[model samples]
Structure formats: structure tokens, C-alpha cells
Target chain A: FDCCLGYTDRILHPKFIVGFTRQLANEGCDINAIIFHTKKKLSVCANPKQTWVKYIVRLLSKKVKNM
Target chain B: ASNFDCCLGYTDRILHPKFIVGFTRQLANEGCDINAIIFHTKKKLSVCANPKQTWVKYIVRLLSKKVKNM
Candidate 1:
């Protein structure tokens, strides 16, 4: 697996993000992040501690659970 | 759960729907040295794929669509 070498604080509308997976700052990864996969097939790395990131994560988590 | 296994190699092999639960990316810039698609299976397995392969993109799109409901 690859680690997130970089991150962006630019918050995007949740609609642009399709889903996300987590990465920890350990072993090969440099920081804890939420890798948000976009509709355009691009992956954006965001800090998990951010408020927007937390909200989106919970939103998606509920989405998965309700499915 | 998060997966941390580095792909030792790549395969152009296409996976069936049963194995295409979701996926993650392995980037070259992160010291893995190769761009890869790591597909997670319902059976809890990881299949490493070559990012350049055409089918790989299709699989990614499929997984992306699934996220809408996931």
C-alpha cells in the first residue's frame, strides 16, 4: 500500500467526493488522513482532524450503514 | 479496516464482481515505487493491480459508484 505523502486543506463540496478510506501516519505513511475519492477519479488527501472532514466521514459512514 | 500492505508486484488481471468490494491506491511518490490499485474483496483479500491497465479504471469507477450507496 502507499502512504499519503501530501495533504490539502482545501475543503471540497461533499458532492464531489464519492467515498473515502483511511490512512494512518505509521510505517510508510507520513500522516493520518482521509483519502477522499472524487467523481473524476482523483484522490484528495485531507487531514482527518478537520471539521469538514469529520462531518463528511460521518455522513458517509451513515450512508454505508443505512445501505 | 485500513490496509497497509505494500504490493510486491503488479498484475493486469481483472477481478470478478464478487471480489470487487472496494479499493485503495498505492502511489509511487510514497516510496512504494509503483502506482497500484489495491482492490479489497468481500472475502477479505487484497488484489494488487497495475494502474495503467484499462480494466483497472473500470473497476475503480464501479467502486466509486458503489460509494453512493455505501
Candidate 2:
């Protein structure tokens, strides 16, 4: 399984994150991503090969963890 | 009660219905019914039911805003 999320997290359509991040791994990006709806969002993480993923992950993790 | 796609700059793959039956026979396998599918959206929508049901897709007027709905 190239997917990892405990599903224990309280987020809407949580499973979707796993597949999306996987796809992003194939299509690398320069900047980080923040998937937000009108008042909702989920952080992005993938491309373990891409070191930048860590920086963005670290920043978003704090926000997700604090909340 | 009802389902919908994201509105605020978020993207999700929504399998849009084409006709009344698509709308009607959804809630239940029994009490399936629909009057009309009133699609109200800010970002335009297209009823290209069978995206794979195509032969030749001509590349013309290729602009993001104009064919965003395409």
C-alpha cells in the first residue's frame, strides 16, 4: 500500500489524501500545497524524494497538530 | 441529505448525472425519484457524460477561461 493515513484523523474525505499525495509524487512541484475549501483544508505530503516536501510538511504539521 | 462538489477553489472528481433517472434512482434502490436536477454553480459545468465516448478532440480556442468548462 503506497497509502498511509491512520484514518484515525478527523477530516472529511480523509482517504482521498493518500491517493492524491501519491499522484503528486509523480508530478513534482516547486511550491507546497494547501488544499482548502471555503473554510476547510488539508495539508499535502508526498514525493519523499523531493526534500521540499519535508519543509512544507513540517510547517503544515504544526498547524494540523496544534488544532 | 444531498451531495455536491467543493465550491471554494477546491477540486474534486464529481460524476455528474445526465438525466432524470441519474438523479432519481440515487437515494434508494426502492424509493428512487427525482423532479429535476437543478445545477447551480459559479464555476460552469459541462454535461459531457461520456468523456471516453469520443473519437477526435479538435484543439481549438484553447484558453483556460473559455474552455475551462469544456
Candidate 3:
């Protein structure tokens, strides 16, 4: 299961991550990986571009061996 | 023996679209106008909504609580 959490500042809040992680684990799925982009300093005030576009084009569209 | 050998097949697929359609239709039949369906498969989270009604948020909160308890 994929989880997307937005950042307000440079730091991701620990409480929210912990709570959500535990919730996902209890549902019996492995937490594969977590990825986040560091927004350019000048763009902090503006929303970071949605990561879904990159994900779909780069990861989902490609075929890879299931390991 | 070779001529009598049998064949088998297996396949796996994600049925997210079907699930979303079914859920939205159920909500619509219940008199809730559904505007969107958002799902977080990794988190096993699903949300249904109607832009005009705020109660959809409450339904999500309720489901979250249930998931936590489960």
C-alpha cells in the first residue's frame, strides 16, 4: 500500500508517520519503501509538484521482474 | 503419459476499478452523490465522496477508526 504525506516544512512530522505506519502494518502488509522529494528552496512557499506523474511514467509503466 | 498430461493456468490482477465503481454506486443508491473515489492501496485505504456533502469526511474518519480497531 502506498502512503503519501505532504510536508509543510523541511521536516516530516514524526507523529503522523508513526501513527500511519502502525496502522498499515496492523493490516498485514509489508512496508516496502518510503520516498519523498526535497523541494527547491525557492519553491517552498508553493506546493511541490505531485509525485504521481513521475511515478506513473517511471515506475508503473515499466515492466520488471518480480523479486 | 505425455498425451494424457494436463495444463493449468494462473493469473493475478488488481480489481480496483471494479471496487471503486461498486462502492460509488452503492453510495449513490443510498442518496449520496459521489463525486470521486480515492484509494490508497498500500495503506488499504479507500475514500468515497460527494463534493456537496461534508459527511463523506465523517464516513472516512469512521472507517479509519474501524480499521485501527481491526
Candidate 4:
């Protein structure tokens, strides 16, 4: 229901991101995105298609596995 | 230019307050006219409700304060 009305092409550094979430294009959303929740409590919208976005996601994924 | 999901309508079904984990605001766009509050549940489901509803407003404030306090 909380769809990304618009997506930002901007890439954020991984340091500010504590965790991330994904919103896929579904019956409720129109775009694919990775939502980065920052330590500041800001929910930022990022383009999922970007190369850096994928890299950061992979980086965070490793932490989960290590834990 | 990918197509994403939008709430075509709103629900009158009141959700249990305990089940909600967080929420996001859905703005009215060209695809839909219904301005909604999307409540995310712990069960990984989303509920769409009218933003004007009294109960919905209350919940929004509760969640807003939650973020503020956090």
C-alpha cells in the first residue's frame, strides 16, 4: 500500500544504512526499490537498478549470514 | 518506467493495533485518487485505509510519535 510514488536515482553510501527493505512492483506498488532505513530514522528511496545498490545489498546480506 | 502497485480502494476493516509494525503514507497520484495510509503488519501484509478516518489519523500520530521517540 505504501508504494514508491517516485524513485530517486541518487545513491547513498552504505555507512548510513542500518538495514534495508525492498518494495517490488506488485498490485500495490508500481516500481522496484530498495528502502534504506538510516540511523537517523529517514526512509530513503533508492533505485534498485543501480550497480551500487546491488553491491550494498550484497554487503548487508553477508552480515546477516555471518551473524 | 516500471509499473508498481497502488491502492485502488480503501478498506473499512479495522486492524488490530498490536499486529502493526510500521506504516507508510500513500499519496494520491495520477493512477489513483484514494489517499491512503498503508499499515505494515508483523505478518508481512499491508493494509490500506483512508487517511481521513479518525482511527487512521490516531494511528498515524501514534506511529509518528513512535518514530520521533526512536
- What iRMS does model 2 reach? 17.9
- All candidates: TM-score: 0.48, 0.20, 0.21, 0.49
Instruction: Select the stronger candidate by TM-score from 3 and 4.
Output: 4
Candidate 1, residues B1-70, lDDT tens digits: the string is 3334578788756777545645666656646767677776544467888766667766666544444333
Error of 1 at A8 (Å): 0.8
lDDT tens digits by residue: candidate 3, B1-70:
1221111211122333323211111123323342232322333443433323334333334433333333
The segments of candidate 3 whose C-alpha lies over 4 angstroms from its true place after superposition are A1-67, B1-48, B51-55
Q: For candidate 2, lDDT tens digit of each residue in B1-70?
A: 3343322221233432221110000111123232111221213232212111111011111111121221
Candidate 4 per-residue lDDT, tens place, B1-70, comes to 4443567788889876656655555445524465566677645678877777777766655543433222
Could you tell which candidate, 1 or 4, scores higher by DockQ?
A: 1
Worst 10 residues of 1 chain B by lDDT: B61-70
Q: True contacts preserved, each candidate?
A: 0.00, 0.00, 0.00, 0.00
Going through the candidates in order, their DockQ values are 0.05, 0.04, 0.06, 0.04
Shift of residue A6 alpha carbon in model 3, Å: 23
TM-score of chain A for the candidates in order shown: 0.83, 0.30, 0.18, 0.83
Across A1-67, the per-residue lDDT of candidate 2 in tens digits comes to 1223222223334222211121222224343222212112233333333334333333332322222
Any runs in candidate 2 off by more than 4 Å, and if so which? A1-20, A23-46, B1-70
List all candidate RMSDs to the true structure: 11.9, 16.2, 17.9, 13.7
Q: Pick the candidate with the highest lDDT.
A: 1
